[PDB]
Every structure is written in structure tokens, then in C-alpha cells.
Design a protein around this ligand. Structure first.
Ligand SMILES: Nc1ncnc2c1ncn2[C@@H]1O[C@H](COP(=O)(O)OP(=O)(O)OP(=O)(O)O)[C@@H](O)[C@H]1O
Ligand SMILES: [Mg+2]
Lengths: 59, 118, 132, 261, 254, 169, 85, 118, 118
């Protein structure tokens, strides 16, 4: 569908498609690698040098 | 056989927690506290809270402390330290455990610290 | 160059690093194009589809999760991928349908999230087409 | 009094040995994760050599550092690079990743810094985090309008040596101005320039962060080995000192008790 | 101090009741406890506990507390050894618990110094190694011709600050056939019997051991050794392959 | 301490040095002579003027080199010189070299000729160079043992012999 | 040891603080008086409030120098306060 | 009062710079200088430069050094030390302060070191 | 001068091979046999063979397990160890040196292993 205006960017669209393949992958294919791909614990702070601190926004 | 099974269990657990804390003092001090496991950290904060909770006001220490003395009864201490051991009171900062009586005094101190901290 | 070489790679592990290929299917935004030898340099977006790697041994297929199909004038086909469809073990109908039904509920949650949800449902239906 | 310090140095030696072993394991994992990312890098960078572009395309600059900064001159080299490129162009942004370069970037012009994200490199490079970072770089900081996109990261050139290196990203407004852009039969329907630019940013930032992860782990392993041998030397010297001290003191009580007679 | 040294001996005395109330004299192990320089109230609590578990009947207690004259504290171990030798030479088996021998050495120090004898290392008398050798060598396993008697000695030496290199500890460790090291940090971590297995040793080994224990103990000791070796990889993620985590699990549950 | 305070210098022999393979095992940094400098034969004074300095910087800079990187390449020059100097100073038991067959080795090691030769062939270089010198340039060693020092023409002759043998080596 | 056990408190001075710049070089960690409120001018006492409890403040500021690394703004404030004092 | 206020301050700051090095020695010895803060790094490198600059050739021990002996006046050395303390000479290599007299000798030695050595 | 030049040579090579093998044991334990170069692998395997060949049956241990002790002469010892050193016995398995005296006994044990194999 629309991922530029309706979505965010091609990167987000591709990441959602990859998460689609990984999460919908069959049981025997599931391993530690796909768990790490699913795992995401980044925090977006966006340091307020002037202003606009995002305060550890979750990934 | 004398102090009761529960008192003995609480004493043993607090003693082993202090043991674990002092065993990790090197790691925390010279290397750093950030390279520890989650359980190691949690034990560290719990043991620090307990060790500053062991401090009590003394009636003959007003010349030095300036804080009125407190006398805490046995079961009061046992229940308070059991609650601290279990983890019911992990959110309270360590300073509220310093120079206090029972855990009710700890709750009062935490609330008042939130008070003048605004 | 002699025939075509395919650099099909996946971030966990590369699949092909210039292996000689008899024919490549590249389901793209416009449509699949068969590149097998020489051809002209091209840049193109790989829509999620079956990038079947036809070879003299067998015409093994792979459903891509997305990527770019680009061609170099020296008969080079650089196909960058993320997640493949190994043979047919990737097929799992029940969880695909479960995700499609459970998350189409949030297909109208919040602009960007809603659009990404709809896109993921669409690629799940693409997998269903690959499910056979 | 020397015995407790000797025991502490024993513990330090044990810690350093354990840390270097786990650093070897993490180095193996990081290398086997980074090989594929390097493949992604090359497979598109050698193709971008065909359409050189390499033109002028106020500026957005990214820095790659690890969350853990226990040791290594990684962050020092990243800091010297960022200070150099900042004094070269004072208007460029100081977008970073991780935390260590963020703390290092307080005493040197802390206003051009715009983005700050920590908790990235502690377990694995991964792909979802890179995609999210690139997506919110595009959406929020409109990276497509910034002329030069420089990414600060350390090249693991050797198993022990490293240095910062740069990978520029051509804007969507200028990838269409490539001298070799004509030989590609583009279509205006799929808006290939901007999608190519976003995919390019994601891939190269992911590869740069993986390489920085590997180099940082290797430097940590080397530093732990160095600390191990230093602790060993300290152990030897203090063992000698402790033996001398115990012999001297026991001589002291014996001579005192002899004078008692 | 305060490590549980007397607890091991007391548990042995209680454990002997399973056969001391039987009929087979070759399995009966009579017990004699030696109190050297201990507080009299401590002896009172001790004997009370012995009667509480009905171990009093096969137990003899010689008590040279701190109040009695130092020569009595010097002679108490020898008279206890003679009492045990009575059983040993009469064909029975007896267990002797010397307990505190450091206080006995201190008493001998007092005696020798007060008699103007030449002092030695930290003013200890010369023939204290000779003294403890005479005391300890009296315990033995008699052959069949003499009655097949036995005397098993369990001296308890307290060390100051963990210094096992002190003069009396060095003397006694050379005499004895194996040691049971008890540590305070082990007691604090929760290991209630604080026997430091990595340092404790037995010279006779498995020769005087139950055969089932021999069958099941080699794997146990190997697993403990491996767990101590891999003990350093515990305070972090500690994966370090399946082998290390398996050894950690096995050793910690052991 | 007291026996050092009573003497006129010391020669320190290090145990770990002995273990490594340095056979004299003399710690140059610690060993020192207080009055022997004025008595040393002037030929050795001339040839061995900077060996103490060379071994010095080779000592502290090596204590700085805890990694196998490019360093500064001047530090690397110092290491690649000091390694040859250290391997040059080894001898064997019951094999006392005299000054006339000693001085040329110090000259070769101080003029930088040793840099090209690999470490494994340093003693090979010593033996072969001694044989070469006693074969053709016997007059050189004869003069350095008779007169007792090196003149400028003698220095030139020794230099020429060094480059002559190094090229063949 | 005899003199520390005989006196009514002590004033520890060490060369390390002396070379750190502290001219009195008073080790407030060990320097203690057996008399507190007694034998003290009241103006330097409860009326000033904190002059009852600067001992705790100077203990804690030393207690978080690097091992008790600054966590939040309270730690930074206490650090600045202690070093200024 | 006796030596002068400027000399007292210079000596005090030299003592501070040299004592910070000794305080941080233990951390530097095991971990390394890269684990220090930026101010700690500045202080430790200044201390290294200073303690190398305290060396002075002697006219008696020139045989043990190879450098002719030199003498420095009090007003010259206090000024040189204050100049080094201010940070006027931090780009100079630390080796340039060894066996020298005044700060001008350090400058000359640095010039030679950058000329032929580097 | 005492044991002979050849004895010194073989002993030195054996001890240095054992030292190198011990030094590589750490990375052998971490990864295994792959990380070592071809000469590193050869040295490790040869040193393992030497370590197994150090064993010798005891004439006083006859009653202990089963093994006939052998009075291996020092000349036979040096000849056997140098023969293993030269590297012509790599195809013989490591256990053919275990509980074995002279090198001809290594050969015989290898032959009996082959006979009981096929
Ligand atoms: N198995 C055990 N279970 C519970 N508590 C024990 C055990 N063993 C020892 N203790 C406790 O450890 C402490 C010291 O042990 P105990 O007094 O029995 O022996 P000890 O080390 O010989 O003593 P001391 O040195 O004072 O003579 C006591 O508080 C005792 O109750
Ligand atoms: Mg006891």
C-alpha cells in the first residue's frame, strides 16, 4: 500500500515486511537469530541541545 | 528452637545478602557497577538499603546525632526486615532507611522526602 | 560476462555471492523481469514476491521480504534481500492467517501504524499465495 | 595490610581473564554477524562506483559508538574526528548513536548535536533497530535535504587495530544527477531515487554500526589482555613484598622476646 | 572462631548412637570429649544437649576449664588419651575429641615461661611439637593379635585470622592425617557445614569409606572441582557455551 | 644495601632475564660503574658512546609498546635497533672475547649495520664477521689492539669493512 | 594507639590532603571529638541548623566521589556543594 | 612572606599537579589512562611533563650523562614552571623536558626532536 | 658438557614444544583445533604425543594395574624422544605412547591397535 505519505518511509515499510516474514516464519525456522531480530530495546532521547528532548522514546 | 523459625530465616537471609554484597565490593568499586547481572544489581541495592536501615537513633546520642532516639520492638524489626527482604519496599530511596526506627518511620520519611523535594 | 552471477544476500547470512544462474525471476513494483545473461544495467525496487532462482539443477524458489533488484552493464545482478523463503519449510499457514486476522484489527490504529499494518497484511497475503 | 591489597589484585587478574574470554566469544559473534553486513555494504557501494555521483551532495553527520565504554581508544578517535570535522564546518550537525560519544560531546560545541540514542550496541548489531533509526532520521530530521551525510565509525582493519572512516550518502536530489544515471532505465512511477537513497542510508548505517561493534569488541579484548599482564606483574611484586614483610615482622617479635630475657 | 568446629564433632557423637545401642561391639564407637580452657557454662550446655539426644550413655567428658590451674589443662588431653587407650587395648573402638589444643599449647607456654625455660617462636616453649606428637601418636589402629582396637583422634585447632602458617597450626597439620578446613565466609554465604572441600583433605582417602560412598563420590569430587574452576563465570550472562553453564548448574545444585 | 653502599658499583643479574635467554642477564638500567668509566679503553669509549643511550630508549619505549601497531616508526626504529643490540651482547660460558675481536662488533651494532640482519642470524653474524675480519682485515684488529684507539682513518677502514661484509651477508 | 585511646578525641592531619591543597589537612573522616553540642558556641549549632549535621554531609560527599558516581541532579548538586565547601 | 607570593603559588600548583599523578597511579597502572576523565588526562600529562622537567644535568656527573652541567637561577625556574603550569607548552613532547635547564632549553630540545627525530 | 650436545638439544626442543602447546591450550579450549595454523596444529599434536610418551610403566606398579614396567635406558630414552621429535611418527595415534616405554614398544602398541581394529 502507501508507505510514503500514509506510512513513514521505505525503511519502515521494508522493516515491517521483514517482521512479517520473521514472525510468520514456520516453527522449525524460529531460532535465536529471529528472536534477536524481533528483540529491540532502543531508546530515542534526541538530546535537547536547543530543545526537543524525546526522553528515551522506545524503538 | 528459641527465636522462632521465621526469625531465624529472616536473619539468615539478611546475613547472606550482606555477604553477597561485600563479596561484590571489588567489582562495584574498581571495575564498575554497570557490568553486573540484573540479580547482582538488585541484591546490591537491597543490601545497601538494609545496611543503612540497620542504623538506629540512640537516646544518649542527641549531642552528636541531634535526632530523638528510637526503640523498635522485636517483631517490629523482624516484620520490617522481612518486608524489605521480600521486595515490597524496593521503590523507597535508600536515604529514607538512614537513621530511622521501624518501617513505618521509613514510609513516613519517604513521604516527607517527597514532600520537601516537591 | 559468461551468463549471469547473482549476489543474493540476507543480513543473517548471504545466500548467493555471484553463483552462476540460468535465469532469475524478480517480482518488482512494475513486474517480474527475466535476467539471465548480459542484459542492460537496471535499477528497480523488489516488491515482495517469489524470486525463483532457476538453475540447471532445479528451479528453486524464494519469496522475498523486499529489496532492490539492480543490474550492472558487466552482466552483474546485485539483488539485496532481507528474509528469504527456503524451499518450502517457510510455509506456515496457521500463524500467517492468525497474524492477518489479529492485526487487521489495528489496520486503522494510527496513520503510519495503520498503513504499515495494511502493508503487512498485504505481504501476508503474498505469503499465502506462496503458501499454495 | 598488604594481604588485602594482594587479594584485591588477585581478584582483578581473575576479572580481566574472564572479561578477555567473554570478549573473545563476543568478537567471534560480532565478526560472524558483521560479515553479512559488509557484504550488503560492498554489493551496493561497488555499484555506486559505476554511478559515481560523488558531488557536493546545513549538513547531517552521524557518529557510531558503543554504549559500553569500559576501555579502548574508540571513543577518543571518534571524538577527534568529530572535533576536526566540526571545526572544518561549524554548521554541520552532530547526530550520534550510542551514549559514550554523547558524553564525550559536551565540552566541544554542544548545540549542533541534534539526535541522541543510547542502548544500541550491547548484544548484537540487529536490523530492526537500524531500520527504525534510518526511518526516523528520514521522517523527523529530513535527511534528504542535507548535502553531505557522513557516518563516523571505526574500521576493524586488523584483529587489534582500528581507525575512524567515512561513508557518504548521496541525496535523492543528486542520485538522479549521476553522470551514469542515464544507462539505468528508471521509471517515474516507483520514485526510484528517494527509495534508493533511503535503502542506501539504512544499509550503510547498519554496516558501519556493525563494523564499529566488532572493532570496539576487539579493542576491549586487547585492553583486557593488557590489564591481565599488568595485574600479573603487580601480583608478583606484591607477593615478594608480602613475604618480606612477614619475615621482617616475625624477626621483630623474635628479637624483642630475646631482648626480654 | 565461631565457624562450627565443635558442631562437626558433636554431630559425629550423635551419629554414633545408631550402633552404640546395638549388640555388635565391633560397630560400637565409644566417645570421649576433652574440654580444654572452655567456659564451664559452655560445658553445661554441651552435656545438656548430649543427654537431650540420649548420647550421654556412651560419652565421657573430661573438663579442664579456664578456671583450673594451667597444669591441669596441660594434663587433661593425656588422661583422656589414657581413658581412650583403655578401650583400644580392651578390643573395643573409641572416639576421642581433643577439641581445643591451642589453649593446651598456651598453658604449656605459661608453664615453661614461669619455670624460666628458654622461649622460642612467639615465646612458645621448645618441646611443644614434641608435646603434640606424643599426644596425637597415641591414637592408632591395633592389629588383630593385640585385639584389633582403634582410637580415632579429632583435635580441634583454632587459627587466628585464617593464618594456617602459624607455629602451632604448622606443627599440628604436620602431625595429623588430613584436615577439615572450616571458613567463616562459607558460613556467611549460607553453606551451613562450612567444610572448604577444596582445602580439606584425607590421607587415608577412600580406603576407610563405605563402598557405596566410594562408588558415588568420584563423580561428586570431579564435579565440585570443575564447578570451583568455572565459578568465576557466574556474575554475568555466563553462557560461555553449554559446558560451562551445565557445570555451573551441577555444581551449585551439589 | 650496605654491601652496595660499600662498593664502587654493581652489576645486576636478573632471573627472569636469565630465563628468557639473555645469557649475561645484566640489567643495564640497574648495573652501573662509578669509576670504571675513566679507566675503560678509549677504543670502546669511541665505539660504545651511545650503546647505553640506545639500550635506554629501547627499554622505556618497549615498556610503552604493549600493542603490535605502527606506533610512530621512530619508536619502531628504536625497537628494531634495540633488539639487535640486545641479541648482540649475548655470549657463552668459558668463551672470553678479547677487545681486538670485540670492538668491531660494537661498531657494527652502533652504526646501524645490524638492522638489516634478522634476529636469528645475529650470532651467526658475529662469528662470520669475526672470521671475515681475521681473514682479510687482520691489520685493523692488530692496530686497534696495539695503539688502543680508533683514528679517523681507522674509523673509515672499520666502516668500509662493515659495509663490505654486510652486503655479502 | 595508647594516645588515641587516652584522649578525648583527635585531630587527624595527613600529608596527602596537605598536598591536595587543604592547608589545615583535617581528615574529617577520622577527626572526631567526644563532645559535640557541648563545648560549642550556639551560633555554630542548632540555630544554624546544618552545623548540627555537616559531619554527615561531608561523609556522604566523600562517599560518592567516583564509586558513588553521579546518578541524577541530586548527586550533581551534592557534588558541587561538597567541593565548594 | 619569605620566598614570595608568586613562588608559593607556583610551588603549590606544582605539588598539586604531581600529587594528582600519584593519586591516580593505581588506576593508571592496571586499567590505563584511557579510563580517566579529560581533566584527569590533562593533569596526568602535565604531571609527567613536570616530573620530567625537574631533572637537571650536573657539572660533576657529566660522565654519567654525557650532557655538560647547567645551572638555573631561581627567577628563571619559577617563571618556567609557571609557564608550563599555565599550559603554554602542552603541544611540546614530554621527552623535551629531560636533561634541560630553562623553558627555552625545552623549546630548543623540542625543535631538534621535531626536526630530525620526527 | 655433561649429558652431551644431542641430549641438550632434544631436551630443549621437548620443553619448548611443551611450553608452546601449554600457551596454545587456552585458545584450544576456547575454539578447538581450527584456529591454529598448520605448523601450530603440528606442534600441538606433536607435544600431545610427547606428553603421552613421557609415561612409563613401573616395575613396582606390576601388582597395581597390569603393566610390565621397563627399565628404559637414558640412551634409549633420548633416541626415542628425538625420533618422535623428527616427525616421522605422526600417523601413530597418541595413545600408542601412553603407558609405553621404549619407542619400539610404541610401534608394537600401534601394531596391536591396528590388529584389534581390522
Ligand atoms: N550445622 C549448624 N547449623 C546451625 N548453626 C550452626 C551449625 N554449625 C555451627 N553453627 C553456629 O555457628 C556458630 C559457631 O559454631 P559453634 O559454636 O558450634 O562452633 P565453633 O566454631 O567451634 O565455636 P567457637 O569458636 O566459638 O568455639 C554458632 O552460633 C552455632 O550455632
Ligand atoms: Mg566451638
Amino acid at each position: 500500500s502507501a508507505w510514503r505519505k500514509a506510512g513513514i518511509s521505505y525503511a519502515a515499510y521494508l522493516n515491517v515486511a521483514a517482521q512479517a516474514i520473521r514472525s510468520s516464519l514456520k516453527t522449525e525456522l524460529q531460532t535465536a537469530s529471529v528472536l534477536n531480530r524481533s528483540q529491540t530495546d532502543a531508546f530515542y532521547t534526541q538530546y535537547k541541545n536547543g530543545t526537543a528532548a524525546s526522553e528515551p522514546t522506545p524503538i | 528452637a528459641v527465636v522462632g523459625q521465621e526469625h531465624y530465616d529472616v536473619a539468615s537471609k539478611v546475613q547472606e545478602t550482606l555477604q553477597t554484597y561485600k563479596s561484590l565490593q571489588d567489582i562495584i568499586a574498581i571495575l564498575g557497577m554497570d557490568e553486573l547481572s540484573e540479580q547482582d544489581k538488585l541484591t546490591v541495592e537491597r543490601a545497601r538499603k538494609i545496611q543503612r536501615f540497620l542504623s538506629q537513633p540512640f537516646a544518649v546520642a542527641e549531642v552528636f546525632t541531634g535526632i530523638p532516639g528510637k526503640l523498635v520492638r522485636l517483631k517490629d524489626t523482624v516484620a520490617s526486615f522481612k518486608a524489605v527482604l521480600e521486595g515490597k519496599y524496593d521503590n523507597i530511596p535508600e536515604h529514607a532507611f538512614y537513621m530511622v526506627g521501624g518501617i513505618e518511620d521509613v514510609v513516613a520519611k519517604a513521604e516527607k522526602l517527597a514532600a520537601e523535594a516537591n | 560476462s559468461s551468463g549471469l552471477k547473482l549476489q543474493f544476500a540476507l543480513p543473517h547470512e548471504t545466500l548467493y555471492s555471484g553463483s552462476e544462474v540460468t535465469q532469475v525471476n524478480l517480482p518488482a513494483k512494475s513486474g517480474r523481469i527475466g535476467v539471465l545473461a548480459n542484459h542492460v544495467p537496471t535499477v528497480e525496487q523488489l516488491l515482495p514476491g517469489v524470486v525463483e532462482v532457476m538453475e540447471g539443477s532445479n528451479s528453486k524458489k524464494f519469496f522475498i521480504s523486499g529489496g532492490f533488484a539492480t543490474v550492472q552493464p558487466d552482466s552483474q545482478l546485485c539483488v539485496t534481500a532481507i528474509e528469504a523463503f527456503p524451499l518450502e519449510s517457510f510455509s506456515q499457514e496457521n500463524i500467517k492467517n492468525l497474524l492477518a486476522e489479529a492485526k487487521k484489527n489495528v489496520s486503522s490504529s494510527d496513520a503510519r501504524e495503520a498503513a504499515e499494518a495494511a502493508i503487512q497484511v498485504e505481504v501476508l497475503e503474498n505469503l499465502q499465495s506462496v503458501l499454495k | 595490610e598488604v594481604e588485602m591489597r594482594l587479594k584485591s589484585i588477585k581478584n582483578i587478574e581473575k576479572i580481566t581473564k574472564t572479561m578477555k574470554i567473554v570478549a573473545s566469544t563476543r568478537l567471534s559473534k560480532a565478526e560472524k554477524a558483521k560479515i553479512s553486513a559488509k557484504k550488503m555494504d560492498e554489493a551496493e557501494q561497488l555499484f555506486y562506483k559505476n554511478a559515481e555521483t560523488k558531488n557536493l551532495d546545513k549538513e547531517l553527520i552521524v557518529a557510531i559508538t558503543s554504549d559500553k565504554g569500559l576501555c579502548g581508544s574508540i571513543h577518543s578517535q571518534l571524538a577527534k574526528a568529530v572535533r576536526r570535522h566540526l571545526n572544518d564546518q561549524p554548521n554541520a550537525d552532530i547526530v550520534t548513536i550510542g551514549d559514550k560519544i554523547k558524553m564525550q560531546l559536551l565540552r566541544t560545541h554542544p548545540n549542533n548535536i541534534k539526535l541522541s540514542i543510547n542502548g544500541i550496541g550491547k548484544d548484537a548489531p540487529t536490523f530492526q533497530e537500524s531500520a527504525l533509526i534510518a526511518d526516523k532520521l528520514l521522517s523527523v530530521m529530513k535527511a534528504g535535504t542535507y548535502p553531505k551525510i557522513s557516518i563516523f565509525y571505526n574500521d576493524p582493519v586488523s584483529s587489534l587495530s582500528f581507525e575512524p572512516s567515512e561513508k557518504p550518502i548521496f541525496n535523492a536530489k543528486t542520485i538522479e544527477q549521476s553522470p551514469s544515471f542515464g544507462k539505468f532505465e528508471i521509471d517515474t512511477d516507483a520514485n526510484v531515487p528517494r527509495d534508493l537513497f533511503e535503502y542506501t542510508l539504512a544499509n550503510q548505517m547498519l554496516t558501519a554500526m556493525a563494523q564499529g561493534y566488532a572493532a570496539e569488541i576487539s579493542a576491549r579484548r586487547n585492553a583486557m589482555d593488557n590489564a591481565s599482564k599488568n595485574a600479573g606483574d603487580m601480583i608478583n611484586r606484591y607477593s615478594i613484598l608480602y613475604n618480606r614483610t612477614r619475615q621482617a615482622v616475625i624477626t621483630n617479635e623474635l628479637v624483642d622476646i630475646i631482648t626480654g630475657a | 572462631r565461631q565457624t562450627g568446629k565443635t558442631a562437626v564433632a558433636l554431630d559425629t557423637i550423635l551419629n554414633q548412637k545408631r550402633w552404640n545401642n546395638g549388640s555388635d561391639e565391633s560397630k560400637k564407637l565409644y566417645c570421649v570429649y576433652v574440654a580444654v580452657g572452655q567456659k564451664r557454662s559452655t560445658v553445661a550446655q554441651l552435656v545438656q544437649t548430649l543427654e537431650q539426644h540420649d548420647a550421654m550413655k556412651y560419652s565421657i567428658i573430661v573438663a579442664a576449664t579456664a578456671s583450673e590451674a594451667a597444669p591441669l589443662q596441660y594434663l587433661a588431653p593425656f588422661t583422656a588419651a589414657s581413658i581412650g587407650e583403655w578401650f583400644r587395648d580392651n578390643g573395643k573402638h573409641a572416639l576421642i575429641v581433643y577439641d581445643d589444643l591451642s589453649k593446651q599449647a598456651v598453658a604449656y607456654r605459661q608453664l615453661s615461661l614461669l619455670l624460666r625455660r628458654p622461649p622460642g617462636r612467639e615465646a612458645y616453649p621448645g618441646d611443644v611439637f614434641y608435646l603434640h606428637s606424643r599426644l596425637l601418636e597415641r591414637a592408632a589402629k591395633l592389629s588383630e593379635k593385640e585385639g584389633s582396637g582403634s582410637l580415632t583422634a579429632l583435635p580441634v585447632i583454632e587459627t587466628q585470622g585464617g593464618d594456617v602458617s602459624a607455629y602451632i597450626p604448622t606443627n599440628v597439620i604436620s602431625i595429623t592425617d588430613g584436615q577439615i578446613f572450616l571458613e567463616a565466609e562459607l558460613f556467611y554465604k549460607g553453606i551451613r557445614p562450612a567444610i572448604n572441600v577444596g582445602l580439606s583433605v584425607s590421607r587415608v582417602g577412600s580406603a576407610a569409606q563405605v563402598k557405596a560412598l566410594k562408588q558415588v563420590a568420584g563423580s561428586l569430587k570431579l564435579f565440585l572441582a570443575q564447578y570451583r574452576e568455572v565459578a568465576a563465570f557466574a556474575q554475568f550472562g555466563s553462557d560461555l557455551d553449554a559446558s560451562t553453564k551445565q557445570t555451573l548448574v551441577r555444581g551449585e545444585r551439589l | 644495601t650496605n654491601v652496595i653502599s660499600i662498593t664502587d658499583g654493581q652489576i645486576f643479574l636478573e632471573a627472569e632475564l636469565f630465563y628468557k635467554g639473555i645469557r649475561p642477564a645484566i640489567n643495564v638500567g640497574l648495573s652501573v660503574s662509578r669509576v670504571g668509566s675513566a679507566a675503560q679503553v678509549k677504543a670502546l669509549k669511541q665505539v660504545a658512546g651511545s650503546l647505553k643511550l640506545f639500550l635506554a630508549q629501547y627499554r622505556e619505549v618497549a615498556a610503552f609498546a604493549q600493542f603490535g601497531s605502527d606506533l610512530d616508526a621512530s619508536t619502531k626504529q628504536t625497537l628494531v635497533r634495540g633488539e639487535r643490540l640486545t641479541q648482540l651482547l649475548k655470549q657463552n660460558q668459558y668463551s672470553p672475547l678479547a677487545t681486538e675481536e670485540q670492538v668491531p662488533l660494537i661498531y657494527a651494532g652502533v652504526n646501524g649495520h645490524l638492522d638489516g640482519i634478522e634476529l636469528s642470524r645475529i650470532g651467526e653474524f658475529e662469528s662470520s664477521f669475526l672470521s671475515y675480519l681475521k681473514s682479510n682485515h687482520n691489520e685493523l684488529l692488530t692496530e686497534i689492539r696495539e695503539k688502543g684507539e680508533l683514528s679517523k682513518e681507522l674509523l673509515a677502514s672499520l666502516k668500509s669493512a662493515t659495509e663490505s661484509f654486510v652486503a655479502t651477508f
